[PDB]
């Protein structure tokens, strides 16, 4: 009910180091593919943890 929201901007994002941080099975994505996140790039990334 009080989920955090962290803004991520002005940095280089390496999405392959996420797998070494938490023990999860699938990097479930909807609009993109989890293996193509290192080539294309965005404006802002928002992280919501609950």
């Amino acid at each position: 009910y009080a989920w955090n929201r962290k803004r991520i901007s002005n940095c280089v994002a390496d999405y392959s180091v996420i797998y070494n941080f938490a023990p999860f099975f699938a990097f479930k994505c909807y609009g993109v593919s989890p293996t193509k996140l290192n080539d294309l790039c965005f404006t802002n990334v928002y992280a919501d943890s609950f």
């Binding site: 392959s16 797998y19 023990p23 999860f24 099975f25 699938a26 990097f27 293996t35 193509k36």
Partner: protein, 49 residues
């Protein structure tokens, strides 16, 4: 033997570490993939190397 993160990379048309440098499946691959947990056999409390 791989880890649980990289089971999704054993698939045709995949990009990662195992798919690019260890084990690559073709784009027109036909066949089956069978993966199962082996925590009780391939792991030790001191660390299997």
């Amino acid at each position: 033997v791989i880890r649980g993160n990289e089971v999704s990379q054993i698939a045709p048309g995949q990009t990662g570490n195992i798919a690019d440098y260890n084990y690559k499946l073709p784009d027109d691959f036909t066949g089956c993939v069978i993966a199962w947990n082996s925590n009780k056999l391939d792991s030790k409390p001191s660390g299997n190397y």
